[PDB]
Amino acid sequence: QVEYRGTGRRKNSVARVRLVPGEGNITVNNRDVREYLPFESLILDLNQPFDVTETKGNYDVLVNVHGGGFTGQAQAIRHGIARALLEADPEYRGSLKRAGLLTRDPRMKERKKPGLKAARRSPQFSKR
Amino acid sequence: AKTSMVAKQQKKQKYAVREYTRCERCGRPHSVYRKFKLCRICFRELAYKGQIPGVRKASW
Amino acid sequence: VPKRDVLPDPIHNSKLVTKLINKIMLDGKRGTAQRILYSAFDLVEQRSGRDALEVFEEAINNIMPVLEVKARRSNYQVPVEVRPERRTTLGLRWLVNYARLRGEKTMEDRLANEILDAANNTGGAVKKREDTHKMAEANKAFAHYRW
Amino acid sequence: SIKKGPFVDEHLMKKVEAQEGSEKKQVIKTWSRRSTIFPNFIGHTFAVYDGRKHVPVYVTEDMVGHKLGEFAPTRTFKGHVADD
Amino acid sequence: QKINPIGLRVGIIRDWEAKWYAEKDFASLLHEDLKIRKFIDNELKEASVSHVEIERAANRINIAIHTGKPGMVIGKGGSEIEKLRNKLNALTDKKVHINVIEIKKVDLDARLVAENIARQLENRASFRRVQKQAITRAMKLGAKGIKTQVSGRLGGADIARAEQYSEGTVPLHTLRADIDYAHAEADTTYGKLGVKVWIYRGEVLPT
Amino acid sequence: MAKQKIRIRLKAYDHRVIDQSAEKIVETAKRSGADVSGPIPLPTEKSVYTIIRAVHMYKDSREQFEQRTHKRLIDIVNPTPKTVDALMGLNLPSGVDIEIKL
RNA sequence: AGAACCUUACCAAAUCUUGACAUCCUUUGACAACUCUAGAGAUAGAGCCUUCCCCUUCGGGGGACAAAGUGACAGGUGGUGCAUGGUUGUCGUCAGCUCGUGUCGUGAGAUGUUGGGUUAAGUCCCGCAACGAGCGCAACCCUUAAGCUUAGUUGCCAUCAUUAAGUUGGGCACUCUAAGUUGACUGCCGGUGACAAACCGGAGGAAGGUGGGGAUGACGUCAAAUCAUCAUGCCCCUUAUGAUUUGGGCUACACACGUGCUACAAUGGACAAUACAAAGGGCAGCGAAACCGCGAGGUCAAGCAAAUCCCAUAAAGUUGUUCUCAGUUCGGAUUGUAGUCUGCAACUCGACUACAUGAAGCUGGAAUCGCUAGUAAUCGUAGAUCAGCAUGCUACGGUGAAUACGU
């Protein structure tokens, strides 16, 4: 067969996408998506790239991912999805870029500076 | 006074640790690093002279 | 200054829930709020048999203020029509505030009671709407020839 | 808090051994910080140097929960005007 | 309020005045260098050196003092530097190859000028004329602008003050400057007199 | 993995000096041999030292330092007393931290 | 950015006098350690030996020793930060502040820097007896947001074979790692706008109007702080305002305030199972497995100068059971007991575990603080300092929204 591979980066995490057309089924790290996301019922947001792009679908997916919390990496899949769907055909880019899902976010945490401490709280003043 | 404590931290001691690590030039014992054995202000100031390998730029 | 909405929360398929859950998540724990909101929305369907959509929509309809006041300057206060975004924000805000003030021991039953009693055009959220609509649109005399 | 063992000042030992084999004394000069009371320390009048003047304290049998470490505090009224 | 540009330009537009193998044991070699940095005053006092560079290989020491008067330090025909090595290894306890090095545009440097101005301030010379003639000579030598500040009780007088006569451009908040900052101190009968000379002599990289 | 090899590790505090030294050593190594391994980078450990811009009070105005440390790895296969000299002969400039091994 | 001692300046006592210590002369000497005694130690009282080592032709020269004489002296955390150098805060990253040539005005001054438009910005355009320049905002630098080339070990396993395992054969496609560049600069278009500045929208792109952040803090103000880092003028002390040691003390206790931590619980309590980080540190340091112990910890010894091994299970979180509104299996304060580690000694004053008690406290008044998106709220982690001791600091990651109508 044929396989399309594009990376996904978000929130100090890394995604190695393996996209192969099919009936549609994902097993992240040889483990199903429901077996990897707490709780969670937000995988339909991960299916939005399949709902607006390649309507309705679907393609089988295998992925290996490590680093960062579950939200940042469960959201890193979509940019690899978009890259692979653009690699498949440039037609899908017009529907992708009007909604995003390809532009990898450039926003992460910030350093820390005097005023913050063990918890991310600013200091007070001397009243009275 | 500081002058006799240069000898105090130099002479032998009754047992293992009645010592404290102070800077060789600056007499201030507080806020010193074992990697260099220089105090707070002296090592900051020598960093600006560009003598000790490494940097002061920060912003990291 | 814009809003930066949140789009999908197909649990259950709806949009107001998506904005609602983001208020109950005290100290940034979204799963607990999602679970309890789901349990409460299944409960409100269980007792007094109906669909969650009808009860929720008509409940937030009975508790959404349409006129509201704002102060400025002696002491005067201009009644002002509320934007739909701020309308729903205030509705959900006061709904959750009075669900907290209800004070029940259950994960879900307090919210079910709140929304289903609002479905009867009664309740503390309805009380807040009535109080605001009584103080407002009764003193619209002075600041009506203004913004 | 030592399970390694007791830690009686050897110096106090050397003096008290001769002090105890023959007739004891009712006054003793020492520093008594690196030691403690043990069964063989009974019947003496040691003096922990509180810092200003060492005060002789007579050894009793019943001080097992208490020890030689300290009996005459340096705070010494109080430091405060009021009381406990 | 302000900081020293040599502390900000470093790592980018200039290497460090000392170099050695970067083993994690820093105290031994750093305080060996400290002894050199102390003892070099005994050559600064008469030669008015600029700054010493110290490379340090495995088994050797190779240093270089930036001075404008080698004669004083090199001896007639080498009569001094070998004796410098003899009195150096007595505390270094390691071999060394001292290599005197000359600076180009000898009297344009900062530390030489600062030391000079402190010097004629030692023997009760007026502050205005010294700095004016210094800055005029520096502008003769070719540069885009220099600054000179003096501090303390000027003219041996009442409570301290601070003055400056700056000319030309002296970019400070920029980052490609490679400006030679320096500093000096001066005592005649009262307190101490410090100076803060500044120069700016073109944009250039070490690479 | 078993094989004939020579492995070296490089340390310096300037990326330009360390990579130029690595380049010249690779040149000499493949000059008197072949199949040399390139200047493989390494996560280049850093340092940090928090210090207060102050003399007597005001810890609020803190300021930071670091000591960046480049590390480099080169491997050589099929040794010879020629690559031995190519390693132990030329390391200049002497800010770099070389340790010859096998 | 580590007060048992030490640190510590102060207190009590015992002690010292070229002194604890630094240079100099004479005088010598290579330099000492372990024991006996006194002593809380300091110190000594003795054994004993530290023993001309580099250069010697009998001397010597010499790094280094030596005790005494010993005069310069040393020494002072002794005063003055209102004499100072230097250094550091604040106004405040506020956008301003000035100088040269000319002109006007008897002059002080103005003039530019004024006026319109415009900007986060004295940023820019136009006009104007002002024209130029400097310091400053900008950027110049570091980091982060994307791609490409270079190079593949300790990193990775996509094609495979195998394995507890990327552990090994291989692989460098991918990720990653660090060097260099590419990229975002009103850059292009349309409209507005004195055609200009500039503004608005759109495309493109990973990233459009200094992208996000950091470093940087103008002339100067607060006679701001520091003579206790240091240096230093002037003044003061010296058989003591200096010096050594032991113990005490910086930690007291009717209370006031600040800062923060933990609770006053059903988004919760306890137990069980279970997935997901980054950064940093480690040589005589990291302590793997195993065994022992309820436990703090103990034996053990592999590996480890570091992409290799360790710290190090990440935690919150998810699946379950139970608890069912009480001062509650809430809270975990106080006390006693039994133990663990460091240090010689945890008694005034170390930390930790188990058992025993289970306090106030059921969201807080007047008043008040912080915060415009990865922020707050919230959860953990590591480091520094460190014989042992951090609710503090620095740093790292996890999770993570509400609203900003408008001046």
- Chain F partners (3+ C-beta pairs within 8 A): A, B, E
* Nucleotides in chain G with any atom closer than 7 Å to protein CB: 1-3, 5-9, 11-12, 20-21, 38-42, 63, 74-78, 82-92, 133-147, 150-154, 157-158, 168-170, 173-180, 204-208, 211-220, 223, 225-226, 228-234, 242-249, 252-254, 257-261, 266-268, 275-283, 306-307, 314-319, 324-325, 336-337, 339-348, 350-352, 367-371, 373-387, 391-405
Question: Residues E193, E110: one domain?
Answer: yes
b/e sequence E181-198, b meaning 16+ C-beta within 10 Å: bbebebeeeeeebbbbbb
Determine contact, residues C50/C107, Cβ cutoff 8 Å: no
Tokens of C129: 């709407």
SS3 A26: strand
Number of domains in chain A: 1
Number of Cα atoms under 13 Å in the Cβ half of residue C37: 25
| Cβ contact B54–F64 (<8 Å) | no
CA distance B32 to chain E (A): 12
Read off the DSSP letter of residue D39: G
Please check whether residue F86 is in contact with residue F34, taking contact to mean a CB–CB distance below 8 angstroms: no
Structure tokens at E188: 């005649």
Q: Using what technique was this structure determined?
A: cryo-EM
The span from the CA of C63 to the CA of A52, in Å, is 35
**Residues F28, F80 contacting (CB under 8 angstroms):** no
Identify residue B19 by its one-letter amino acid code: E
Q: Is B59 annotated as a binding residue?
A: no
How many Å apart are F68 CA and G399 C1'? Answer: 32
Distance E24 CA to G287 C1' (A): 22
Task: Report d(CA E163, CA E155) in Å as an integer.
Answer: 12
The Cα A8–Cα F59 span in angstroms is 42
- Closest C-alpha to B38, from F49, D35, C134: F49
**3-class secondary structure, C78:** strand
Residues in chain F: 102
Kindly state whether F45 is in contact with chain B, defined as any CB-CB distance less than 8 angstroms: no
Q: Are B47 and E7 within 8 A, CB to CB?
A: yes
Q: Kindly report the three-state secondary structure assignment for every residue of chain E.
A: CCCCCHHHHECCCECCCECCCCCCCCHHHHHHHHHHHHHCHHHHHHHCCCCEEEECCCCCCEEEEEECCHHHHHCCCCCCHHHHHHHHHHHHCCCCEECCEECCCHHHCHHHHHHHHHHHHHCCCCHHHHHHHHHHHHHHHCCCEEEEEEEECCCCCCCCEEEECCEECCCCCCCCCCCCCCCEEECCCCCCEEEEEECCCCCCCCC
- Nearest alpha carbon to residue F54 among F64, F62, F65: F62
Give CA–CA dist C16/F56, Å, rounded.
57
Q: What is the resolution of this structure in A?
A: 3.7
Residue C140 has which token pair?
């619209």
Element (H, E) at C109: helix C109-118
Pairing of strands A26-28, A59-66: parallel
Residue-number span of the structural domain to which A24 is assigned: 2-126
End-to-end CA distance of chain C: 21
Question: What b-and-e string marks burial along E140-153, b requiring 16 or more CB atoms within 10 Å of the CB?
Answer: eeebebbbbebbbe
Chain F residues 23-42 with CB within 8 Å of chain B: none
Distance CA A94, CA A74 (A): 24
The nt closest to B31 (CA vs C1′) is G1
Judge whether E99 and E63 are in contact, CB under 8 Å.
yes
State the DSSP H helix or E strand holding residue D15, giving kind and residue range, or none if neither.
helix D10-21
Residue B47 is labelled as binding a ligand:
no
Q: Which residues contact A112 (CB under 8 A, 6 or more apart)?
A: A120
The H or E element containing residue C56 is: helix C52-62
The answer to whether E55 contacts F97, with C-beta atoms less than 8 Å apart, is no
Residue D62: count of CB within 10 angstroms of its CB: 7
Please list, in sequence order, all residues whose beta carbon lies within 8 angstroms of the beta carbon of residue B1, skipping any fewer than 6 positions away.
Answer: none
- B26 annotated ligand-binding residue: yes
Nucleotide nearest A70, CA–C1', reads G276
- The single-letter code of the amino acid at F10 is L
Determine which of E4, E23, E25, E26 to mutate to test the interface with B (most B C-beta atoms within 10 Å).
E26
Token readout for D60 is 């009793």
Contacts of A114 in chain F (CB under 8 A): 60-62
CA dihedral E37, E43, E45, E51 (to 10 degrees): -50
Distance between CA atoms of residues D35 and D5, nearest Å? 12
Categorise residue C114: left if φ over 0, alpha if ψ from -120 to 50, beta otherwise.
alpha
Specify burial of residue E26 (Cβ count, 10 A radius: 0-12, 13-18, 19+). buried
Map residue C22 onto helix, strand or coil. Answer: helix
**For F83, phi and psi rounded to 5 degrees?**
-70, -25
CA–C1' nearest nucleotide, residue B42: G229
User: Are chains F and B touching, using the cut-off of 8 Å on CB pairs and a minimum of 3 such pairs?
Assistant: yes
- Per the CB < 8 A criterion, the answer to whether E36 and E65 are in contact is no
Cα D13 from chain centroid?
12
Give the H or E element holding residue F70: strand F70-76
Last residue of a domain, one of E104, E125, E151: E104
Q: What backbone phi and psi angles, to 5 degrees, belong to A14?
A: -140, 140
Task: Among E52, E70, E104, identify where a domain stops.
Answer: E104
* Alpha carbons within 13 A on the beta-carbon side of E103: 21
CA of B2 to C1' of G18 (A): 20
Q: Is E129 within 8 Å of E165 (Cβ atoms)? A: no
Exposure string for A61-77, b = 16+ CB within 10 A, e = fewer:
bbbebeebeebbbbbbb
Q: Which chains have 3 or more CB–CB distances shorter than 8 Å to chain B? A: E, F
Contact of E58 with chain B, judged by CB distance below 8 Å, is answered with: no
CA distances from E29 to B37, B51, B53, C120, E24 (A): 12, 12, 11, 85, 10
What torsion do the CA atoms of F50, F55, F57, F62 make, to the nearest 10 degrees?
-20
Please tell me the distance from the alpha carbon of residue E129 to that of residue F71, in angstroms, as a whole number. 54
DSSP state of C82: P
The residues, any chain, with a CB within 8 Å of residue A57's CB and separated by 6 or more, are A24, A47, A50
d(CA B52, CA E16): 7
Whether the CB-CB separation of A24 and A58 falls below 8 Å is answered with yes
Tokens of E66: 């930036």
To the question of whether residue B8 is assigned a binding role by annotation, the answer is no
Which class for C72: exposed (0-12), middle (13-18), buried (19 or more C-beta within 10 A)? Answer: exposed
**C117 close to C61: Cβ distance less than 8 angstroms:** no
- Residue E22 and residue F93: Cβ atoms within 8 Å? no
Nearest by CB to F13, from E22, E55, E56: name it.
Answer: E22
Expressed as residue numbers, the domain containing D38 is 6-77
Give a yes or no: residue D1 inside a domain: no
Considering E104, E127, E145, which residue would you say is the last residue of a domain?
E104
Distance of CA F19 to the CA centre of its chain: 8
Contact D29, D47 (CB under 8 A): yes
Do residues E138 and E113 make contact, with C-beta atoms less than 8 angstroms apart? yes
Q: Is B54 on the interface with F (CB under 8 A)?
A: yes
Question: What φ, ψ does residue C71 adopt, rounded to 5°?
Answer: -95, 155
Closest Cα in chain F, distance from residue A116 (Å): 11
Whether residues E55 and F93 touch (CB distance < 8 A) is answered with: yes
Expressed as residue numbers, the domain containing E80 is 15-104
Does D21 reside within a domain?
A: yes
For residue D69, count other CB atoms closer than 10 A to its CB. Answer: 12
Which residue, among F78, F7, F69, F87, has the nearest Cα to F40 in the 3D structure?
Answer: F7
E89 in the same domain as E119 = no
Pairing of strands F97-100, E62-67: unpaired
In a domain, E5, yes or no: no
| Count of H-run helices and E-run strands, chain F | 2, 5
- Please tell me if residue A118 touches chain C, with a CB cutoff of 8 Å: no
CB-nearest to F13 from B31, B40, B53 is B53
> Which is nearest to A4 in space by CA: A14, A16, A13?
A16
- Compute the nearest-CA separation of A98 from chain C (Å): 15
Report how far residue C23's alpha carbon sits from residue F92's, in angstroms, rounded to the nearest whole number.
64
Candidates F16, F69, F97; nearest CB to E21? F97
Reported residue count of chain E is: 207
Task: For residue E50, give the nearest of E61, E64, E62 by alpha carbon.
Answer: E64
Sequence-distant (6+) residues with CB within 8 A of D43 are D20, D24, D59
Peptide bond into A56 cis (omega under 30): yes
Number of structural domains in chain F: 1
C50 token code pair: 């109906």
What is the DSSP secondary structure assignment for residue C115, as one 8-state letter?
A: H
- Taking only Cα atoms into account, the Rg of chain A, rounded to an integer number of angstroms, comes to 18
Count of domains observed in chain E: 2
Contact of C113 with C102, CB cutoff 8 Å: yes
User: Is D42 among the domain residues?
Assistant: yes
Rounded Cα gap, residues B13 and E51, in angstroms: 40
* Other CB atoms within 10 A of residue B40 CB: 19
Q: Hunting for tokens 């995490």 — which residue is that?
A: A13
Full DSSP string of B1-60: --HHHHHHTTS--SSS-------SSS---SSB-TTT--BHHHHHHHHHTT-SSSB-----
C7 contacts: CB under 8 Å, gap ≥ 6: C15, C18
List chains touching E (3+ CB pairs under 8 A). Answer: B, F
Q: How far is CA C131 from CA C84, C92, C144, in A?
A: 20, 17, 20
If asked whether residues E100 and E29 sit together in one domain, one would say: yes
Cis ω before A58 (30° cut-off from 0): yes
